Amino acid sequence: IVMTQSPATLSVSPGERATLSCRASQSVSSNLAWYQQKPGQAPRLLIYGASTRATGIPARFSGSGSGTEFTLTISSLQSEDFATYYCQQYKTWWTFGQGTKVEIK
Amino acid sequence: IVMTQSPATLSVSPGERATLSCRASQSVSSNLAWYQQKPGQAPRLLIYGASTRATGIPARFSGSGSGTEFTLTISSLQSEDFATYYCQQYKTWWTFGQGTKVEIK
Amino acid sequence: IVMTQSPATLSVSPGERATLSCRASQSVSSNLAWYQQKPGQAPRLLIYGASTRATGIPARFSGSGSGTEFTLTISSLQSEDFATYYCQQYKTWWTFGQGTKVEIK
Amino acid sequence: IVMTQSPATLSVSPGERATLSCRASQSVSSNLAWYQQKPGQAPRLLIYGASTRATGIPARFSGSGSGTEFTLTISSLQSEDFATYYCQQYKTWWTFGQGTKVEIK
Amino acid sequence: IVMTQSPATLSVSPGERATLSCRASQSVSSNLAWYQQKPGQAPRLLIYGASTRATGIPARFSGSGSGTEFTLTISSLQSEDFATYYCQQYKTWWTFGQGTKVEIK
Amino acid sequence: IVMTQSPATLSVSPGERATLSCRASQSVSSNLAWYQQKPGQAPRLLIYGASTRATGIPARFSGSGSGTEFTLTISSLQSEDFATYYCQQYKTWWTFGQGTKVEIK
Amino acid sequence: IVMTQSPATLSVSPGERATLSCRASQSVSSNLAWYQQKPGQAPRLLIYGASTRATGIPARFSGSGSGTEFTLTISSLQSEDFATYYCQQYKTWWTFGQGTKVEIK
Amino acid sequence: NPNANPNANPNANPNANPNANPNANPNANPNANPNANPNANPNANPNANPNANPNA
Amino acid sequence: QVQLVESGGGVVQPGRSLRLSCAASGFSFSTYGMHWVRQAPGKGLEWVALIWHDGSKKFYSESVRGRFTISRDNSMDTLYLQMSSLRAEDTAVYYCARDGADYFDSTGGAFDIWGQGTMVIVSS
Amino acid sequence: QVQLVESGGGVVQPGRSLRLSCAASGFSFSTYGMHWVRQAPGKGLEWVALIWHDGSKKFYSESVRGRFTISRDNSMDTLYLQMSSLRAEDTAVYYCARDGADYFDSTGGAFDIWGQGTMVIVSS
Amino acid sequence: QVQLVESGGGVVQPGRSLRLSCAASGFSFSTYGMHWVRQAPGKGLEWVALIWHDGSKKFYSESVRGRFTISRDNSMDTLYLQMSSLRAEDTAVYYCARDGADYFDSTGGAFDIWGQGTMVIVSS
Amino acid sequence: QVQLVESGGGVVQPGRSLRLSCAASGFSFSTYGMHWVRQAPGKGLEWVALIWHDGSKKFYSESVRGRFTISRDNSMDTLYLQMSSLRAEDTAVYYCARDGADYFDSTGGAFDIWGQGTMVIVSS
Amino acid sequence: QVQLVESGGGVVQPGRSLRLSCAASGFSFSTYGMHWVRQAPGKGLEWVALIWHDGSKKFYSESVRGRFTISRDNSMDTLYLQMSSLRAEDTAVYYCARDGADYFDSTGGAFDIWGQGTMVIVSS
Amino acid sequence: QVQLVESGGGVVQPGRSLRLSCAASGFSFSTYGMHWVRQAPGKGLEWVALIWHDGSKKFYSESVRGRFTISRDNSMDTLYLQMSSLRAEDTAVYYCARDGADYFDSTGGAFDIWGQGTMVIVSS
Amino acid sequence: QVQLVESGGGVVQPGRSLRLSCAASGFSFSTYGMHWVRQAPGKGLEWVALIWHDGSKKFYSESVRGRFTISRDNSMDTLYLQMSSLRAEDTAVYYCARDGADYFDSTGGAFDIWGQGTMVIVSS
């Protein structure tokens, strides 16, 4: 089982930059995804392949990394970008992270 | 031939709950029906689609299961519910079970 | 084209046993049939599925095999078993053999 | 995306031999086709499987090659053979070449 | 061929401990399994990986060893544990032992 | 390049003993093969590992030698054993010998 | 670390002979290589093993030397031979020289 | 040894290993192949299905 | 008000032909596929035959194929089962049942409406 | 009483069209796929065409594809074969055959029932 | 006699919808998977969409996926392309093409048969 | 217009069975692999099961293996999850997800499209 | 409910062919490699043949290589063993077994699930 | 019953391309590495190319490296050889050979099984 | 036709990550080892990392050990280099190089084939 870890909570004022990190217990070769979930709503895919944005995902969401260290960066965090962000690997099985909550500062 | 098996009999006092089981040799994807036949009368359809009740069927009859294993549940067993119950599939052919008898304890 | 081949001709006296064979150019997974034809008459199915006899076929006719090599066995040759025997596959297309004739010895 | 490349233009007088080229960015295992399109008309299949001629195609058209390099050879060029010739792969997706125009010298 | 040895027969009264042994001609890197077979029945997997118990196996069965020497230990031998135990490797090929019969003393 | 050399020809009367030879430029540690080829036919393996006969090879064919010097011996030469005999090594690359023809004396 | 040193620059007119040199801090037994890199282009291997020309190298390129001192001699220098030349050893590790520049006189 | 030859040995055994995992990989592409044959199989069953809807 | 009234039953010796009927009322008989269901004395239920709504496709059980023929007359809403070469194993209660499938189910349904059933006795 | 009766045979000159028929009785013709099988005088058996139970999918041999057309009308239980641009190689006995597959075999079956056969003669 | 006839082209302003048709004859339409191929004026050929022989699987180009839908009606031997959210980049001749794979080719084949083509003009 | 709609949730007693359904539209359902993902109240997301595009291969989480079964029927574009022997730990919102892999990605992709979710309550 | 059911045993005289079958249920059959194991009367267990999860690779014992063929049909969840040129030493109980390897084990595992067994007798 | 059959030989002029095929049967093709062997008229045997069991590693002769390409299709049990820029020195009989090494030999084996061979003639 | 193509370059600020790729064609990628060679603007060539043909052994320079990760995928004939803890000193042109040693050299060889080279810029 590949364990995926994330920071617990992140406080960012609107317009700033948010750097979310993801760490994998083993190596996932660019097989990592990022999701956004608002309370009461389904998860929404943001990044796949650790760097590729989804269809209608704005350019302010950017991901990078490979192997065991991955980062999700949001530049100029908007009002609609305050949500829980999840990290998932799909190399060995389908395991998720516990999520990082972005709250207004 | 998709063979259908049911327990031989069960003894339940009025007011209790009766759980009937039905197993198919192969997969029957929610194409199962339950019939109630009293001696000297024609069979009466209770459940079709393995979960949907017929027109004049009280809510005390409920079915569940799909594939091979199916279950019929009768809550608050009444005096009219002591009869033989048949399990039929209609996926490969129209084959029946050997029946399960509900007898007053 | 899956080429189907049968032995040319064999002479058998009545009451004996005949062992016909049929080889397929490619693998036909138990999708083989045997037909009996007499002059001036239509063919008649004997064995299908490489092992299953037709409806009104006596037990003296028998076939076995799968994959590439198939055999037909007729025990206790009768006066009615003097006819042309055809081998057919129905896995890729419907191709026949050239027919093996049995003759009075 | 398997991108397909062909020479731009090719000038040969009637009766001579024309050799058209085609290169695949990835491996196309004899999954290549050649088409002939005259102005104002629909394309017409010439070669499939990189070497097999179509039904009503004269023997003066021939193709060869596999993997990533393919050629179309026309012997005894006629007055009907002056048209644009397209190269298409059908291994990963259905992508065409940009065509080679055959013009009278 | 990696040929597998085992002791022939050991006699233990119910409630005591039974120590089975297994030796290999060559080295099998924790690729050893233990099976229990009662007369007239199919074998039943007990230990795989030379130490790991199967799903529904009581904790009284324990295996150990790696390489050439392996042991199977049964603590508090019960009435159901009187049967033949087989030792199998799956490193080079699938070769079994000759079995050890545990009989009531 | 490992050069393998064999004698040009041997004339042996039927029933006698033939002793072919093969010398390699470098050492081939029991990685030598022997083949028998009749005119118009594909080669047919006799010995592999410089001493081990193939599946359907009669016991009259025998090989020996290791390192650089090897020898194929035929005892009680038959009528079917008149053909060209090749020596191959498969230790460094796959290089054949020039062959030795055995002829009726 | 095996340091390699090469001349800084030398000016030779076309048609003459250019002699390059390479010195290693330690011993490299015929495990030395030479590359030709023009500005804006990838290095192009010329000599490997300190004496052997590569595949597509004209005969005017030649190298020699063993142990500590190595040389690269270009006979009848052409307009195509004006570039930087790098010296590499691959005996203990993969180290490169600082490069020698041949300039038009 | 860092400087050992990293090139494949031509004479290494090219035959498959019997004791390799014969089971499937969960993380293999489950989506369809676009270039699979889209045409009908001639030998598919031409006979009617008894359980097809008999109602108009 | 939905009924299926069957008739034509009785006692017939083995080998002869007996013709059953099923009178349907209270629904549109011309748009439904009709079944026949069998129940031996002291035994379970067995399916016998099926016919499409228009009379095109007919399906029979392996124990009655060839001997039995199912037919319908949509004009006056009657379903028929023609049995020939009757045997002692054909002694049972025959039920006329309607197919309980939605018009867009595509896979058939359960037996929604059952008839009263008619006893057919095969004895010497 | 599972019978197939071919008709429409006779003598036709090359290049002209002929239509064969096959009347079915004794089974539900609308639920079976039907084949045409060919046997040249002094030669073996050759498969010609196949049509689905509903007439949806049709398959032909390479020697007859483009020239022959197989069609059915389940109303009167008759199978048709339209042969056009006939050639001397087409002279043979044409057998109407039934697909003897189980309804859930998923792979098609052998030719269970054959017709009487009809002669088509193509010569001048 | 194997022909494909496209229809439904014309002039449409950007952002609107347009439906193409393709009528097939001379071959068994229900057994073939069919394609749509595109050629802009003065440009090369571009593949658009594919549908299975029965309609189960559909595949689309990256430049039309989502906007375009491919469908068929095997009863009428007709192929459809539903073009929506039309753009100036969609102006082209649209060709209806048949997949020329052998029934056991395992990989699909070239575009065996093409239509005459229908012109779609997307402009104001 | 790519949508996944879940149904079949509600309150169920421990040890009983419950069946989920997921209806797909706006894309070709038969060419994608489908997943089930589970989110317990106040917890993170958890993968449950995967089914191939044709239903051949199925994979399950260790926490639900043996009890749950994933199935599909491409005819009406529906995905199913049969949950049996339900426990209190099975209480969650169950999401229907599509596999977001390119058709030649060789490994499988992320969960591209998610459903709205259906709440399953296991309690007394 | 993980089960393996063997069938097709019996008595066969030496020199002929016999086919074994193994039906699987309660798990995804298409994702597992399958084995055949043999136990002669009064002797120990002997491994016979292995087939990959997709049927790509087959491996056989030295005793049965060339005579026996292993095959599978993942659509029907069934495994096969075709034994030809049967000899007296082939008389045994033939067990159908599942490769008990984790999906990422890289080496193949023990025999997790065994069938009930089928007896094959080779005698005159 | 182990067989190798070569095909695709004939006459080709120098400087052109031609493809050879080798169909295997009677053994598990995907588990073996395959060779091509060449025998010029009046000369000895010459090894051409080697391919792994999975197609991963390909090794070629110095005489054909760069010009010839070896490939396989394990699904169809067929081996391939593409020969481009053919020369008059390439006229020979091409044999298809199997690597007869034990699965745990670690060193590769001899050519246990040979095909019938095919002639390629490179002349004008 | 031997080519090596590097891709995945660009400009990345110090401290972040970037990934490199190397595509191989015209030769058997799985048979050769691979190298990365670095050339700073205005500086000489610097060897980065070596990986075996099968990926068993990886070696790195002292300057990039730990930070950089080299990997290959023999199936896709691709070589990957992962750049972690990027600094401004890593701004250079990166080359993909093949170990062009003979298969029986036992000592390694020079870099026979060089790629076009990709530009990597590390600045704010």
K103–chain H Cβ distance below 8 A for any pair: yes
O82–chain A Cβ distance below 8 A for any pair: yes
Tell me how far apart the alpha carbons of residues C61 and C38 are, in angstroms, rounded to a whole number: 16
Contacting L with CB below 8 Å, chain B residues are 29-30, 51, 64-67, 69, 71
- For chains H and J, having 3+ Cβ pairs within 8 Å is answered yes
What's the 3-state SS for chain A? Answer: CCCEECCCEEEECCCCCEEEEEEEEEEECCCEEEEEECCCCCCEEEEECCCEECCCCCCCEEEEEEEEEEEEEECCCCHHHCCEEEEEECCCCCEECCCEEEEEC
Phi, psi of B81 (to 5 degrees): -95, 10
Phi, psi of O91 (to 5 degrees): -65, 110
K3 half-sphere exposure, CB direction, 13 A CA radius: 5
Q: For residue C85, give Cα distances in angstroms to C11, C26, C92, D43, J118.
A: 13, 21, 21, 50, 21
I112–chain H Cβ distance below 8 A for any pair: no
Tell me how far apart the alpha carbons of residues J63 and J74 are, in angstroms, rounded to a whole number: 27
B92–chain H Cβ distance below 8 A for any pair: yes
Task: Look up residue A67 and give its two tokens.
Answer: 């192997």
Determine whether the interchain pair J66/K28 forms a contact, defined as Cβ–Cβ distance below 8 Å: no
Tell me how far apart the alpha carbons of residues O98 and K39 are, in angstroms, rounded to a whole number: 42
R_g of chain C computed on alpha carbons: 13
Q: Are strands L10-12 and L118-122 parallel, antiparallel or unpaired?
A: parallel
* Cβ(D50)–Cβ(D30) below 8 Å: yes
Tell me how far apart the alpha carbons of residues M122 and M117 are, in angstroms, rounded to a whole number: 16
Architecture of domain M3-122: Sandwich (2.60)
Residue to test with chain N: of M57, M60, M84, most N Cβ within 10 A: M57
Q: How many CB atoms lie within 10 A of CB J87?
A: 13
Tell me how far apart the alpha carbons of residues E86 and E34 are, in angstroms, rounded to a whole number: 6
b/e per residue, D34-48, with b = 16+ CB within 10 A? bbbbeeeebbbbbbb
Q: How far is O28 from chain N (nearest CA, A)?
A: 6
Q: How far is N109 from chain H (nearest CA, A)?
A: 8
* Cβ(C26)–Cβ(N3) below 8 Å: no
Tell me how far apart the alpha carbons of residues E90 and O113 are, in angstroms, rounded to a whole number: 43
For N116: left if phi > 0, alpha if psi spans -120 to 50, otherwise beta; the answer is alpha
Record the resolution, in angstroms: 2.7
Q: What is the DSSP letter of I11?
A: E
Q: For chain L, what are the domain ranges?
A: 3-122
Tell me how far apart the alpha carbons of residues I84 and I19 are, in angstroms, rounded to a whole number: 9
* Cβ(K41)–Cβ(K114) below 8 Å: no
* Cβ(L91)–Cβ(L120) below 8 Å: yes
For M62: left if phi > 0, alpha if psi spans -120 to 50, otherwise beta; the answer is alpha
Residues of chain H with C-beta less than 8 angstroms from the C-beta of N51: 14
H42–chain M Cβ distance below 8 A for any pair: no
Tokens 């015209």 -> residue? O26
Q: How far is I99 from chain B (nearest CA, A)?
A: 11
Task: Find residues 25-54 of chain J whose CB sits inside 8 Å of chain C.
Answer: 35, 37, 44-47, 50
Q: How far is M15 from chain L (nearest CA, A)?
A: 37
Q: For residue M105, give Cα distances in angstroms to A54, L61, M34.
A: 33, 17, 16
N19–chain O Cβ distance below 8 A for any pair: no
Residue of H nearest to E92 (CA): H19
Determine whether the interchain pair A45/L110 forms a contact, defined as Cβ–Cβ distance below 8 Å: yes
- The closest alpha carbon to B35, from B63, B2, B10, belongs to B63
Determine whether the interchain pair B90/I109 forms a contact, defined as Cβ–Cβ distance below 8 Å: yes
Q: What is the DSSP letter of K65?
A: B
Task: Look up residue G54 and give its two tokens.
Answer: 């590569």
Tell me how far apart the alpha carbons of residues L123 and L90 are, in angstroms, rounded to a whole number: 10
In CATH, G4-104 is 2.60.40.10:
yes
- The closest alpha carbon to G100, from G64, G62, G73, belongs to G73
The DSSP result for D39-51, as a single string, is: TTS--EEEEETTT
Q: For residue F28, give Cα distances in angstroms to F7, F33, N36, N44, N112.
A: 19, 11, 22, 20, 19
Q: For residue B7, give Cα distances in angstroms to B1, B12, B35, B87, B102.
A: 19, 14, 15, 11, 11
* Cβ(E22)–Cβ(E72) below 8 Å: yes
Q: Across chain H, which distance is largest between two alpha carbons, in Å?
A: 79
Q: What is the DSSP letter of K26?
A: S
Task: Look up residue L101 and give its two tokens.
Answer: 């892999």
Residue of H nearest to D90 (CA): H35
Determine whether the interchain pair O30/N56 forms a contact, defined as Cβ–Cβ distance below 8 Å: yes
Tell me how far apart the alpha carbons of residues L47 and L36 are, in angstroms, rounded to a whole number: 6
What's the 3-state SS for G7-20? Answer: CCEEEECCCCCEEE
Q: For residue F8, give Cα distances in angstroms to B59, C3, F100, J80.
A: 98, 44, 5, 72
Q: How far is J85 from chain H (nearest CA, A)?
A: 25
Residues of chain F with C-beta less than 8 angstroms from the C-beta of N109: 48, 90
Q: How far is I115 from chain B (nearest CA, A)?
A: 7
Tell me how far apart the alpha carbons of residues E43 and E46 are, in angstroms, rounded to a whole number: 9
Q: Are strands L92-100 and L110-114 parallel, antiparallel or unpaired?
A: antiparallel
Determine whether the interchain pair M28/L57 forms a contact, defined as Cβ–Cβ distance below 8 Å: yes
* Cβ(J30)–Cβ(J42) below 8 Å: no
Per DSSP, the three-state class of I43 is coil
Q: Tell whether the torsion through CA atoms of I12, I18, I19 and I22 is positive or negative.
A: positive
Determine whether the interchain pair D29/N16 forms a contact, defined as Cβ–Cβ distance below 8 Å: no
Q: How many beta-carbon pairs under 8 angstroms link G with H? A: 6
Q: How far is N59 from chain O (nearest CA, A)?
A: 8
Task: Look up residue H12 and give its two tokens.
Answer: 């290494």
Residues of chain G with C-beta less than 8 angstroms from the C-beta of H2: 92-93
Residue of O nearest to G100 (CA): O44
R_g of chain L computed on alpha carbons: 14
Tell me how far apart the alpha carbons of residues D64 and D50 are, in angstroms, rounded to a whole number: 6
H or E stretch covering K120: strand K118-122
Residue of H nearest to L58 (CA): H26
Task: Look up residue H39 and give its two tokens.
Answer: 């045409």
Q: How far is C55 from chain J (nearest CA, A)?
A: 10
Position I116: which residue type? Q
List for chain N the helix, strand, coil content (%; round to 5): 5, 50, 45
Position N97: which residue type? A
Q: How many beta-carbon pairs under 8 angstroms link D with K? A: 50
Determine whether the interchain pair M19/C71 forms a contact, defined as Cβ–Cβ distance below 8 Å: no
Residue to test with chain K: of L28, L78, L103, most K Cβ within 10 A: L28
- The closest alpha carbon to N49, from N81, N76, N75, belongs to N81
Q: What is the DSSP letter of I15?
A: T
Task: Look up residue N81 and give its two tokens.
Answer: 């050889």
Residue to test with chain A: of O79, O82, O85, O86, most A Cβ within 10 A: O82
Task: Look up residue D77 and give its two tokens.
Answer: 């060029």
Position C50: which residue type? A
J30–chain I Cβ distance below 8 A for any pair: yes
Chains in contact with O via at least 3 Cβ–Cβ pairs below 8 Å:
A, D, G, H, N
Residues of chain H with C-beta less than 8 angstroms from the C-beta of B92: 51
Q: How far is C76 from chain J (nearest CA, A)?
A: 25
Burial of A98 (0-12, 13-18, 19+ CB in 10 A): middle
Tokens 């906007």 -> residue? K67
Tell me how far apart the alpha carbons of residues H32 and L30 are, in angstroms, rounded to a whole number: 8
I53–chain J Cβ distance below 8 A for any pair: no
Tell me how far apart the alpha carbons of residues M82 and A55 are, in angstroms, rounded to a whole number: 52
J110–chain H Cβ distance below 8 A for any pair: no
The separation between CA E73 and the C-alpha centre of its own chain, rounded to angstroms, equals 8
Per DSSP, the three-state class of N56 is coil
Per DSSP, the three-state class of L103 is coil
Tokens 């997943």 -> residue? L35
Position J44: which residue type? G
What's the 3-state SS for chain M? Answer: CCEEEEECCEEECCCCCEEEEEEEECCCHHHCCEEEEEECCCCCEEEEEEECCCCCCEEECCCCCCCEEEEEECCCCEEEEEECCCCHHHCEEEEEEEEECCCCCCCCCEEEEECCCEEEEECC
- The closest alpha carbon to M86, from M10, M6, M2, belongs to M10
- The closest alpha carbon to F102, from F1, F5, F32, F7, belongs to F7
Determine whether the interchain pair M59/N30 forms a contact, defined as Cβ–Cβ distance below 8 Å: no
Tell me how far apart the alpha carbons of residues M24 and N102 are, in angstroms, rounded to a whole number: 32
Tokens 């040249």 -> residue? J40
Q: How many CB atoms lie within 10 A of CB O88?
A: 11
Burial of K5 (0-12, 13-18, 19+ CB in 10 A): middle
Residues of chain M with C-beta less than 8 angstroms from the C-beta of L58: 28, 31
Q: How far is G29 from chain H (nearest CA, A)?
A: 13
H26–chain A Cβ distance below 8 A for any pair: yes
Tell me how far apart the alpha carbons of residues G88 and E95 are, in angstroms, rounded to a whole number: 53
